[PDB]
Each structure stands twice: as structure tokens, then as C-alpha cells.
Write a protein that holds these residues in place. Structure first.
Motif, mmCIF file in Angstrom:
data_model
loop_
_atom_site.group_PDB
_atom_site.id
_atom_site.type_symbol
_atom_site.label_atom_id
_atom_site.label_comp_id
_atom_site.label_asym_id
_atom_site.label_seq_id
_atom_site.Cartn_x
_atom_site.Cartn_y
_atom_site.Cartn_z
ATOM 1 N N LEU A 59 0.839 -1.192 0.000
ATOM 2 C CA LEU A 59 0.000 0.000 0.000
ATOM 3 C C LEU A 59 0.879 1.249 0.000
ATOM 4 C CD1 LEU A 59 -2.543 -1.109 2.798
ATOM 5 C CD2 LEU A 59 -2.853 -1.316 0.335
ATOM 6 N N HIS A 60 0.413 2.295 -0.689
ATOM 7 C CA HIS A 60 1.143 3.570 -0.793
ATOM 8 C C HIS A 60 0.788 4.435 0.413
ATOM 9 C CE1 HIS A 60 1.287 3.124 -5.492
ATOM 10 N NE2 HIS A 60 1.799 2.080 -4.859
ATOM 11 N N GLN A 61 1.352 4.034 1.544
ATOM 12 C CA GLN A 61 1.068 4.642 2.829
ATOM 13 C C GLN A 61 2.338 4.493 3.652
ATOM 14 O OE1 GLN A 61 -0.184 5.793 6.204
ATOM 15 N NE2 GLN A 61 -1.412 3.907 6.372
ATOM 16 N N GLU A 62 2.672 5.507 4.441
ATOM 17 C CA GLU A 62 3.920 5.455 5.196
ATOM 18 C C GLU A 62 3.739 4.865 6.588
ATOM 19 O OE1 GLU A 62 5.282 9.453 4.588
ATOM 20 O OE2 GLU A 62 3.825 10.362 5.957
ATOM 21 N N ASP A 63 2.526 4.917 7.131
ATOM 22 C CA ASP A 63 2.261 4.336 8.444
ATOM 23 C C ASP A 63 2.400 2.819 8.397
ATOM 24 O OD1 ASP A 63 1.135 3.963 11.141
ATOM 25 O OD2 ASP A 63 -0.729 3.434 10.093
HETATM 26 C C1 LIG Z 1 2.360 8.372 0.825
HETATM 27 C C2 LIG Z 1 3.355 7.508 1.411
HETATM 28 C C3 LIG Z 1 3.730 6.419 0.362
HETATM 29 O O1 LIG Z 1 4.026 5.282 0.682
HETATM 30 N N1 LIG Z 1 3.741 6.837 -1.011
HETATM 31 C C4 LIG Z 1 4.076 5.964 -2.088
HETATM 32 N N2 LIG Z 1 3.980 6.315 -3.372
HETATM 33 C C5 LIG Z 1 4.385 5.244 -4.164
HETATM 34 C C6 LIG Z 1 4.374 5.326 -5.632
HETATM 35 C C7 LIG Z 1 4.787 4.148 -3.483
HETATM 36 S S1 LIG Z 1 4.672 4.384 -1.858
#
Ligand SMILES: CCC(=O)Nc1nc(C)cs1
Ligand SMILES: CCC(=O)Nc1nc(C)cs1
Ligand SMILES: CCC(=O)Nc1nc(C)cs1
Length: 282
Positions: A59-63
Motif C-alpha cells: 500500500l502507498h502509505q507510510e504508516d
Molecule cells: C504516501 C506515502 C507512500 O508510501 N507513497 C508511495 N507512493 C508510491 C508510488 C509508493 S509508496
């Protein structure tokens, strides 16, 4: 050996359990450390079904980027699939986040929400046009657009909106509704018809992200679907279709997710489906 006659040879000799156990013994073993972190316990339906680290969808999430989902990338066939568990009450928002981020067109569901008197996955899509769903943790809105109910499966058109950007996309939901509570279907005819309907929609094609396919654990029925699709595609691509080895294809797919095909009956059913399917293609 060829497939159809290897098949009769295993039936006459009654050795499906031994063939299936060989596959289990030879299958890849890769680490799944992220799946087993304590913070992810309520993101896994079954403690013994986990995505490998090397092939897991992030998932595109930092947590917390974790979801119980794997990318199966088939190089010769030029097909990719995402195989995932049925969503849990606390992962329905993650599920639709993945669909959005991976640019999938279609979702393939091979189970019913309740089977054997127990819940096998969350009710993760809306059942009425006028009652849409909002997933606040991932900022997505999901609306039922239309529904077509047939005797063995249902197709739904859904609208997914990213509320952050107001972008919208059309997602197709292909729901196979008649797999029996116990065992496998007696004939592969309705499963093959269903596979062909998914294909005809564009959901498996390279101009879209990978199709998302699930059942309850995302390895048994789900494995049968992608194994049959890939074997039939290879039989169309190669000069010699009798060279396609279903056991070798399955072991290749098991490099990317553990446990694909859960019983010897599912293995036999996969053979049957590929055999019958190869006659209809021509
Ligand atoms: C928003 C935090 C995050 O993980 N962003 C990401 N963007 C991509 C394309 C991979 S992870
Ligand atoms: C009712 C929703 C539906 O069946 N949509 C489909 N679109 C295509 C292109 C095939 S089936
Ligand atoms: C273990 C699975 C299995 O043996 N299935 C069989 N079905 C028939 C009809 C013969 S063997």
C-alpha cells in the motif's frame, strides 16, 4: 506426458493424493516476515496463509503498507494476477486502496459472504444503488452502478472515486456464486464460461493493472482460476500445445504465493478444466 492421458493414468491408478503431496514437497519456501509482525495480526484472516515478502503488494502509505496480497507475474504467458484473501472488517478500505493504486479494472470473487454457516469475507461492496459506501480510513467512495444476476455468476458495475482528487474509475465485479460449500464442481463448464466472461471484459489484458482475485484465503479456488487461465493461454501461444505441463506451471506460480491449490480434488478439477477448455478454444 501429455495432459489428458496423464489424467486417465492418475484416475485409473488412484494416485491424486501422491501427486499433490509431491507438489507440496517441491514448492518454494520464502520469508514472510512483514506478515508476521505483531502490528499486522488483525490484517490476516488465517495465521498459516501469508504473502511472501518478495512478491507482496505494498500500500502507498507510510504508516503501515501491509495487505495480505501477492503479485503473481507469469513471464512466458505475459499475464499478471493479484491474489488476496477475502477482506476483513478492518481491511475493506485497504482492499479498495490496492485496487485504486494498482490500476486494476476487475475484481474476481469466487466465494459467498457466508458459507457453511460462517462468514468467509466482509460485505465489501454496496448492494443498492442509492446506498453508497465511504471508506474513511483511505478516503474512497464506492457506488453500485448496475448488477446482472445470472444462474452461475453475477456481474456488477461499480464506480470508485478517490475523494482526495475527485478522480473516478469504473471497476467490474465478477462474482462466481455457485462453487459448492464442500468439494469441487462436478463439471468445469460453468467455471470455464465464467473465466471467458472475465477475459471478454478486458479485465485480464495488458492495458490495465492486474486483476484482483480472491476467495476466503486467496489460495485455493483463486489458484484454480489463475492456473487454468495461464495454462490455456500457453496452449494458444506455443507451437506444441501438448508441451504445457500443469504441474510445472503450478510450481512456478507457487514461487509468488504459498499454498496455491489446497486439495488433491482441486488439483484434479484444474486438470479437468484445462482439458475441456482446450477443446472449446478451437
Ligand atoms: C504516501 C506515502 C507512500 O508510501 N507513497 C508511495 N507512493 C508510491 C508510488 C509508493 S509508496
Ligand atoms: C453489468 C455490468 C457488465 O456486465 N459490464 C460488462 N462490460 C463488459 C465490457 C463486459 S461485461
Ligand atoms: C482425491 C481426489 C480424487 O481422487 N477424485 C476423483 N474423482 C473421481 C471421479 C475419480 S478420482
Amino acid at each position: 506426458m501429455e495432459m489428458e492421458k496423464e489424467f486417465e493414468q492418475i484416475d485409473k491408478s488412484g494416485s491424486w493424493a501422491a501427486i499433490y503431496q509431491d507438489i507440496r514437497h517441491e514448492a518454494s519456501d520464502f520469508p514472510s516476515r512483514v506478515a508476521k509482525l505483531p502490528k499486522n495480526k488483525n490484517r490476516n484472516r488465517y495465521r498459516d496463509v501469508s504473502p511472501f515478502d518478495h512478491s507482496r503488494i505494498k500500500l502507498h502509505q507510510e504508516d503501515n503498507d501491509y495487505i495480505n496480497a501477492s503479485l503473481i507475474k507469469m513471464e512466458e504467458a505475459q499475464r499478471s494476477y493479484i491474489l488476496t484473501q477475502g477482506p476483513l472488517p478492518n481491511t475493506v478500505g485497504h482492499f479498495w486502496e490496492m485496487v485504486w493504486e494498482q490500476k486494476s479494472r476487475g475484481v474476481v470473487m469466487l466465494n459467498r459472504v457466508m458459507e457453511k454457516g460462517s462468514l468467509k469475507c466482509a460485505q465489501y461492496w454496496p448492494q443498492k444503488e442509492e446506498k453508497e459506501m465511504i471508506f474513511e480510513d483511505t478516503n474512497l467512495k464506492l457506488t453500485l452502478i448496475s448488477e446482472d444476476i445470472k444462474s452461475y455468476y453475477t456481474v456488477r458495475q461499480l464506480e470508485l472515486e478517490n475523494l482526495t482528487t475527485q478522480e473516478t474509475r469504473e471497476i467490474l465485479h465478477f462474482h462466481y456464486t455457485t462453487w459448492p460449500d464442500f468439494g469441487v464442481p462436478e463439471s468445469p463448464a460453468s467455471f470455464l464460461n465464467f473465466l471467458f466472461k472475465v477475459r471478454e471484459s478486458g479485465s485480464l489484458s495488458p492495458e490495465h493493472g492486474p486483476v484482483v482475485v480472491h476467495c476466503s484465503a486467496g489460495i485455493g479456488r483463486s489458484g484454480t482460476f489463475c492456473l487454468a487461465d495461464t495454462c490455456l493461454l500457453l496452449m494458444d501461444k506455443r507451437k506444441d500445445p501438448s508441451s504445457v505441463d500443469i504441474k510445472k506451471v503450478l510450481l512456478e506460480m507457487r514461487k509468488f504465493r504459498m499454498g496455491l491449490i489446497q486439495t488433491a480434488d482441486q488439483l484434479r478439477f484444474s486438470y479437468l478444466a484445462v482439458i475441456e477448455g482446450a477443446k472449446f478454444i478451437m
